[PDB]
Write a protein that binds this ligand. Structure first.
Ligand SMILES: Nc1ncnc2c1ncn2[C@@H]1O[C@H](COP(=O)(O)OP(=O)(O)OP(=O)(O)O)[C@@H](O)[C@H]1O
Ligand SMILES: [Mg+2]
Lengths: 66, 819, 392
């Protein structure tokens, strides 16, 4: 797996979002019954989490307060 | 009208007592059809049936003066029908009413009356059984059983038919009626009869079910019942009933999982377990478990933190348990100075861990070879012992390298080296009953003029090699070692292992020895009683007889021999109760009550009693009481509790019990012995990264005699755990009864193929009708999975027909053209 | 006692309870023999007599405050002057949690037992004690949302093997945001139907209390109760209520609501490291929610609910009209399956209205005219929409 590519395709996301990306990548393999999650699974998971769940993001408002 | 029906009853009775033959026949037939119509609604005690009660004495009196065989024959049937409400149990009315007349084809009557007559048949058959101690003949009952059985078989009364044939004790007539659609449910309801039904009818049930299966070409269960029976010629007959080679390979896989040495040409590789190593490395590749786990990774001491030799020994044991069968590790393989960190006996287990890691793989012999050249006797003994484990449970057809390399070092004058040699011989050939091993060990073993430790370990090796079916020569040799030795040596802890070795020989059969018990009873040494009860209860293992449990408890109710007999008592009750899970659950409360009122010697086994009974299935209600007794006093009790956790959590990777074990590691850290046994329990908890277990009994309730033998070997002398703390080399005995726990959809050519496998909690098919599912809470899981203790498997896909019905272990598939 | 197989009559069943009685009598015999062997003068049931006479009567009730120098404690009864009560051996020194209800002796006032609360004066309402009704069959369509909720909340509890083997901690929380009246509450009822865990429902309004102090107090109590009765499926509903409304009964105003929300956002994640407490919130207005709550790591899988489509509408019609005393004149195909906009709530509302109207006429069967009248009745009683005019 290419961890550098996965990290690059996830700009300005707090570590909790990376943990959620890992969890969803693990989940997507389970739904397809595969016992090993591959890069194609991680890409789908990171797209879904970072892009799909972007309107419900916290790191863009609270940054102004800091 | 109902009043008109009462008038019909009265007038028909009057015409029956009217002597006219035409009136005789008319009233007889009219009452026959009326009581047939009285059964229009066979419920709520029909009102015509209620009103027939005062009539029954009138029909009886009329029948007494009747002399019409062409008409009284049907009146006998009528009296049989009316005897239902005429309960008066013990009078056996309807049964003798069904006699005399040749109209006993009662199929025209309702299910209620037929059930009632079957119950009366059972009652009067019990009355005949008592009548044949301290009227209808035994052959007389067959006259109606041979009609009732087809009636039940036709009208889905398979359970009722089996019940009736059991109460009549004539189950040998069952196969004459079995249909191609009826056999499966009859057997499924019938294979469960063996554990609970009182002997010796259990063997009769097994043989009858085997006969049913053979005639239906369903050898998948038949091989299992043959293994239960243990008759080798019966397994041979199963083999001769098959012409397709694929079924031969699959039966070979089943009996290799059972570790039973049945010799067959062209198949010997599969039965010899030679393909297990490749299957396991394929499993490791598929589950991505190839990456070895450090014992520190198991400890996780870095997260919980603010003698080096013993901790190194514990780490070596953990590493050996972790990477077992994966043939790769980073702690010991690449670090030769690692062995030197352990001192004394620790060096032996250090090298033995390499053989443990290379188990089932002949590759490991090369790595173990280098440590054989080291002049240190402990290193030589450790490597030599690991040689057997590296090929444990593996038997090529012609020349076992382990036997060739092992036989030279048995006669070594060193006690340690010879002990390791005999231990490795027992490990490698466990459950094989090898004839060359027989002829080597039998003169080498016994030897009442040899060190008692060596003799005891050789006896343990003998017991592991020959499990079940008994053996006269081994028994005579063991009793020769029982001669007197010397009075002090009989008090040593080694004689306990000799007693266990004697006991293991008969564990399979039960109720079959019945003679050595007298021979043991003819000796009046103080230890003899303990050996007697231990062997007697060990033979009965897998049955659940309660009278033996009463005897064992009477022994329990209230000096070294006394300690040993009280020790064997709880192990015996645990083994006997280790049959049906109902006996399991009752034995839990038994051990609880005994722990309530028990002396201090018996205190430090109740944990082990829970552990052996509940091995590889970490049920919730088992380990909480174990945790309660872990913080209790009598440090040996705590050690036993944590080892019972380890056995209970064997291979399940239970994170909850792992957290409990880590907490106990934090607590019992001052006492280094407790820390060492805690780390051993940690290593056993995550054995083989979760792909292997200590399960005593598999699906279809076969008995893995090797696994039980290993568990008893490790639990027999641990009432004094300091002994195995000194001699820890016996802790590798678990590697003899260890087995993988997985599914593998082998193709016809012999390669794994992906397929959907339905996995869920097991449910029995006993009282359910039709075709109910055997799985609750299904998971649509793919090719090889890890079904825990309590789950079966079944093919979701319509295609890929499995030859074996029981989907466990290696499974072969064929492409059904449908869909 | 264990369970009994099989259900019907069978000789093996009789053998099973024969083993039951055999083992039970054997335990009874062992206990009898053990007792008889014991020195009754300090054994058997004389221990009960000694415990009763040492305990004294009546046992008063107080509150524990400390465990200093075990075998000593400072109780605080509501009226007594807070004695320096000593702790006796009979009591279990593991349940003496500071703040429990101990049993003081009457005269000497030494603790002779801990009275467990076992009251739950408010939690009993919260604690789901009987499964509501609907199973997952009653939900028409929504297959993806059901799959997601299952693999998030059910599979971790019933079937942890997949997750532990895969090596991922299960997704912590799920928020069901969507349009009003679209099954966001039904799916919670379904997951409450098949459950092996306690289901403590709470609605966001009840967290807007009146006093300043009891804003975080309620949330702390709810999550503590969820923790002790592990696992828990706490179902905070109408979570947007804290933001909007601005109730007059609330003394603090906005600030107290902010403190309550801060306590909620802590208790969900916490420094305390709570165990198996799954959280399922559902709201109509996901917009007016402070993004601290909906941040990943607190509630991971944010399931979206959408108004049903035509096929989903017909499936909902079929499932809801399954238990109908329907005359054949009614045609389900053109009944409400018209493509002129509906919702998951309208389909059931019109069925209820038509059933009521049929009851009014005492007609046991349902007429197509009544169904049409209820259809138009539901149509008029409908705030249509506002944003469609932008795209109209
Ligand atoms: N797909 C569906 N299948 C079956 N019933 C449905 C479906 N969608 C909605 N319903 C019905 O709609 C009714 C009302 O909707 P419901 O209360 O579930 O909506 P909600 O959006 O969760 O509620 P609220 O907006 O009031 O918080 C429910 O009683 C349910 O029976
Ligand atoms: Mg709702």
């Amino acid at each position: 797996i290419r961890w550098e590519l996965i990290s690059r395709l996830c700009p300005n996301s707090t570590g909790a979002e990376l943990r959620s990306v890992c969890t969803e990548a693990g989940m997507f393999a389970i739904r397809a019954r595969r016992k090993v999650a591959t890069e194609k699974d991680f890409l789908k998971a990171v797209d879904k989490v970072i892009s799909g769940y972007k309107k419900f993001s916290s790191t863009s408002r609270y940054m102004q307060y800091n | 009208e109902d009043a008109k029906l009462k008038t019909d009853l009265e007038l028909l009775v009057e015409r029956l007592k009217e002597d006219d033959s035409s009136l005789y026949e008319a009233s007889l037939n009219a009452l026959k059809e009326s009581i047939k119509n009285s059964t229009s609604s066979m419920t709520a005690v029909p009102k015509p049936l209620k009103f027939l009660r005062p009539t029954y004495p009138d029909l009886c009196s009329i029948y007494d003066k009747w002399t019409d065989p062409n008409l009284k024959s049907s009146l006998a049937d009528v009296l049989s029908i009316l005897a239902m409400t005429y309960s008066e149990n013990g009078k056996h009315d309807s049964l003798r009413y069904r006699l005399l007349s040749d109209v006993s084809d009662f199929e025209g009557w309702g299910h209620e009356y037929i059930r009632h007559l079957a119950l009366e048949i059972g009652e009067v058959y019990n009355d005949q059984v008592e009548k044949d101690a301290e009227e209808f003949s035994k052959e007389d009952t067959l006259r109606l059983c041979l009609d009732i059985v087809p009636y039940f078989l036709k009208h889905n009364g398979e359970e009722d038919a089996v019940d009736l044939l059991l109460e009549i004790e004539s189950i040998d007539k069952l196969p004459q009626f079995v249909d191609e659609n009826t056999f499966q449910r009859v057997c499924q309801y019938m294979v469960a009869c063996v554990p609970l039904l009182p002997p010796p009818e259990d063997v009769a049930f097994l043989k009858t079910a085997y006969s049913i299966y053979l005639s239906q070409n369903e050898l998948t269960d038949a091989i299992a019942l043959a293994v239960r029976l243990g008759e080798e010629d019966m397994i041979r007959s199963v083999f001769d009933a098959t012409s397709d080679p694929v079924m031969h390979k699959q039966l070979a896989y089943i009996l290799a999982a059972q570790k039973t040495s049945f010799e067959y040409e062209g198949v010997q590789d599969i039965i010899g377990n030679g393909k297990l190593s490749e299957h396991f490395l394929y499993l490791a590749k598929e589950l991505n478990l190839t990456g070895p786990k450090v014992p520190e990774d198991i400890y996780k001491s870095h997260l919980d933190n603010s003698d080096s030799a013993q901790q190194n020994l514990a780490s070596s044991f953990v590493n050996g348990f972790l990477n077992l069968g994966y043939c790769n590790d980073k702690l010991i393989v690449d670090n030769d100075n690692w062995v030197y960190k352990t001192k004394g006996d620790g060096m032996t287990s250090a090298v033995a861990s390499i053989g443990s890691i290379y188990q089932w793989n002949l590759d490991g012999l090369q790595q173990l070879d280098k440590y054989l050249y080291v002049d240190e006797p402990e290193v030589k003994a450790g490597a030599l012992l690991g040689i057997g484990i590296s090929a444990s449970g593996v038997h090529d057809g012609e020349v076992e390298p382990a036997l060739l390399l092992l036989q030279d070092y048995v006669t070594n004058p060193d006690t340690k080296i010879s002990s390791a040699a005999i231990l490795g011989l027992g490990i490698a050939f466990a459950g094989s009953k090898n004839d060359e091993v027989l002829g080597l060990l039998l003169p080498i073993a016994a030897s009442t003029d040899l060190p008692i430790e060596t003799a005891a370990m050789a006896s343990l090796a003998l017991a592991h090699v020959f499990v079940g079916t008994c053996n006269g020569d081994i028994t005579t040799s063991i009793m020769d070692n029982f001669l007197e030795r010397t009075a002090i040596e009989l008090k040593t802890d080694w004689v306990r292992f000799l007693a266990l070795a004697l006991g293991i020989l008969y564990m399979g059969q039960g109720e079959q020895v019945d003679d050595v018990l007298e021979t043991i009873s003819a000796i009046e040494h103080p230890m003899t009683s303990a050996i007697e009860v231990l062997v007697g209860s060990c033979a009965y293992t897998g049955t659940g007889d309660v009278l033996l449990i009463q005897d064992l408890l009477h022994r329990l109710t209230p000096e070294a021999g006394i300690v040993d007999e009280l020790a064997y008592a709880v192990l015996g009750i645990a083994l006997i109760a280790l049959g049906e899970d109902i006996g399991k659950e009752m034995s839990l409360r038994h051990f609880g009550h005994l722990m309530h009122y028990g002396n201090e010697h018996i205190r430090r086994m109740v944990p082990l009693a829970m552990g052996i009974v509940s091995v590889s299935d970490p049920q919730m209600k088992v380990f909480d009481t174990l945790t309660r007794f872990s913080h209790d006093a009598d440090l040996e009790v705590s050690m036993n509790s944590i080892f019972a956790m380890g056995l209970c959590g064997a291979g399940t990777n239970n994170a909850r019990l792992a957290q409990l074990l880590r907490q106990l590691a934090s607590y019992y850290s001052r006492e280094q012995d407790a820390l060492f046994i805690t780390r051993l329990a940690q290593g056993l908890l995550h054995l083989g990264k979760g792909t292997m277990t200590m399960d005593v009994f598999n699906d279809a309730h076969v008995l893995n005699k090797v696994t039980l033998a290993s568990i008893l070997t490790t639990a027999v002398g641990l009432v004094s755990p300091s002994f195995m703390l000194k001699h820890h080399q016996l802790f590798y005995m678990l590697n003899a009864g260890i087995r993988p726990k997985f599914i593998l959809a082998l193709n016809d050519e012999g390669e794994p193929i992906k397929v959907n496998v339905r996995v869920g909690q097991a449910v029995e098919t006993v009282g359910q009708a039709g075709r109910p599912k055997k799985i609750t809470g299904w998971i649509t899981q793919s090719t090889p999975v890890l079904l825990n203790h309590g789950e079966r498997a079944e093919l979701e896909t319509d295609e890929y027909i499995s030859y074996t019905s029981h989907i466990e272990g290696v499974v072969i598939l064929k492409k059904n053209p449908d869909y | 006692l264990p369970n009994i197989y099989p259900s019907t009559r069978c000789k093996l069943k009789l053998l099973r309870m024969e083993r039951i009685k055999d083992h039970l009598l054997l335990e009874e015999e062992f206990v009898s023999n053990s007792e008889i062997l014991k020195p009754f003068e300090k054994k058997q049931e004389e221990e009960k007599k000694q415990l009763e006479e040492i305990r004294g009567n009546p046992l008063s009730i107080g509150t524990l405050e400390e465990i200093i120098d075990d075998d000593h404690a400072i109780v605080t009864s509501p009226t007594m002057p807070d004695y320096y009560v000593s702790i006796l051996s009979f009591v279990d020194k593991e349940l003496l949690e500071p703040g429990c209800s101990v049993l003081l002796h009457h005269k000497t006032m030494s603790i002779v037992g801990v009275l467990q609360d076992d009251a739950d004066p408010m939690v009993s309402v919260m604690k789901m004690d009987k499964s509501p009704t609907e199973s997952y069959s009653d939900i028409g369509g929504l297959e993806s949302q059901i799959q997601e909720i299952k693999e998030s909340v059910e599979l971790p509890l019933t079937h942890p093997e997949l997750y532990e083997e895969m090596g991922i901690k299960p997704p912590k929380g799920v928020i069901l945001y969507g349009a009003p009246g679209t099954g966001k509450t039904l799916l919670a009822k379904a997951v409450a139907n098949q459950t092996s865990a306690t289901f403590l429902r709470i609605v966001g309004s009840e967290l807007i209390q009146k006093y300043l102090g009891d804003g975080p107090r309620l949330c702390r109590q709810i999550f503590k109760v969820a923790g002790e009765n592990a696992p828990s499926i706490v179902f905070i509903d109408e979570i947007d209520a804290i933001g909007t409304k601005r109730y007059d009964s609330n003394s603090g105003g906005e600030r107290e609501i902010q403190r309550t929300m801060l306590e909620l956002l802590n208790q969900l994640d916490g420094f305390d490291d709570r165990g198996d407490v799954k959280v399922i919130m559902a709201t109509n207005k996901i917009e007016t929610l402070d993004p601290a709550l909906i941040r990943p790591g607190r509630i991971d899988r944010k399931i979206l609910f959408e108004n049903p489509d035509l096929s989903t509408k017909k499936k909902i019609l079929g499932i809801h009209t399954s238990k109908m005393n329907l005359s054949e004149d009614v045609n389900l195909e053109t009944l409400v399956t018209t493509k002129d906009d509906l919702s998951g709530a309208d389909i059931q509302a019109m069925c209820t209205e038509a059933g009521l109207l049929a009851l009014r006429e005492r007609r046991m069967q349902v007429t197509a005219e009544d169904f049409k009248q209820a259809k138009e009745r539901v149509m008029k009683n409908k705030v249509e929409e506002n944003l469609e005019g932008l795209y109209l």
